[model samples]
Target: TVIKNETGTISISQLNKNVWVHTELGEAVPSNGLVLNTSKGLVLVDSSWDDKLTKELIEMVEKKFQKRVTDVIITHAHADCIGGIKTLKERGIKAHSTALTAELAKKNGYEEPLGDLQTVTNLKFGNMKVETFYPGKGHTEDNIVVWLPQYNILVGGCLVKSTSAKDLGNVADAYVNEWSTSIENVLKRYRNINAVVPGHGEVGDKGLLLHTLDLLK
Candidate 1:
């Protein structure tokens, strides 16, 4: 199932029974995030490109699921991920990210997130179990991935590129050399991944992680 607005700048596609991928077009690229429909409420993996779009994305998801967004996990400090920090705060929704990401966000001029996640933090929202893994540095020094244990879905964020990506998009704050090691850590940690969602471009399977590694070469 897929839902899109009139402008088609924003859309949400069902990945499985309880998970949906929400995408919004940025100035030059389209960004992707996850919307998890859990027993308690909705959980977002990342925000849209800006506050307006992020607000729209939230409204669409809440209206569709009939639940409020309980929490959001920032995958990195990039604007594409944390641009809507103010929107989340205004809504009283809790935002979680690694301490490094929070610091980077502050340094980057965005509002800091909860900065409560550790290297490996496991959280359960009702029946949904979300694990945040900091697999070293890749796209950015604070980049991390979200694992949905029950769904076998990995929100690799910017750390893993899409299979169609010809090259790494932005590496201004990236650890190009250590990216491979980070991807390897993810592969070692999660096996038999059913779906992998990259920060930009199409959704794919484990091959996306491998593709990102190949792009790094």
Candidate 2:
């Protein structure tokens, strides 16, 4: 299925059978975040700079999946990740994330994420489990990877993929020195992951994460 955005040519697609990504990056949109829908509810990973696009995605999702939204898990504090909390709240879906992420969002004039959050570890949603793990900051201080154990998927906000992708391009709040080690940890820790989707660029293969670490190293 394809989701059309009002921002001219920018749009999102559901390429995989189990996952769907909203491609706002092709436009002026940055970060290239996506939404991963599970049986419980749709998981809004990161919001794009385009408010209309984000809101439209929520609406489009409502038309297809379990209508009432919420269940948001922001991967990081980049404007593209937490930008749409305000629009999401206006639509009645509460945003969620860590303390620093919420603060960063508020400081940037973005709305404070509304729903429940976890400073570390995970949140359970019915039969599914949504977990957060901070490998000591990569893209930003608040950057966190959301793990879907059942699906074996990791929605990496900006920590894993970079501009060149094969090489690390961690732009903001990035712990340059520790970045590589952190990714190394993710490589070993999230071993069961089926795919590693980055914050920007394409739907990555597993090597994407490893290559990101290799760049920093």
Candidate 3:
């Protein structure tokens, strides 16, 4: 089921049994994030473009699932990924990210997340297990992919592009040369992925990873 507000700036839809994808229209593109319903509480993958939208997203998800967002994992230091960080902090929600991402966030003037993640970090919120993998560098130096082992879903963030993406959206801070190797690392790490959710656009399967490699080529 799809739920959209009156302005239609934010929308969310169920992806699997206990997973949902939230989308928000930002300046140029629509960004996507994952919302996982765990026994303990809800775990959000990324935040919306700004604090207001992010607050609304939390409210919507909380209302829909009847659970508060206990923690959020920042995928990268990009605005699309960590823009609403202040909102999370204001609400006292725990935020997690790599040390590099935390530093970048501070350097970029955004609130820093808890720099507690390593290159490969495994976290268990209730029964929901999430693995964050730093696939070298692609979209940004700190871009990481979240793997939900239980559901076989990969939240590729900005490192992986959608099937419809015509070109790499932004390369100002991207590692164009090493992007492929990074994607290869992800491919080698996970198998039988059921769904791949990019930072933007529609959700897909492993083909999205290949498509990102094609675009890199």
Candidate 1 weakest ten by summed lDDT: 20-29
Q: What is the TM-score of candidate 2?
A: 0.84
Backbone clash count, each prediction separately: 0, 2, 0
What lDDT tens digits, residue by residue, belong to model 2 across residues 69-163? 65667777666777677787777666777787778878877778742456457766545566788766667877778777777877776787743
> For each candidate, what TM-score against the reference?
0.97, 0.84, 0.97
**Candidate 1: regions farther than 4 A off:** none
Winner by lDDT between candidate 2 and candidate 1: 1
lDDT of 1 by residue, 1-217 (tens): 8999988989999988888899998835799999999999999999988899999999999998999998999999887899899999999999999999999999999999999999999999988899999999888998999998888889999887887679797787789999999999999999789989998889899999988888888
Stretch of 10 with least lDDT, candidate 3: 20-29
The TM-score between candidate 3 and the true structure equals 0.97
What lDDT would each prediction earn against the true structure? 0.92, 0.69, 0.92
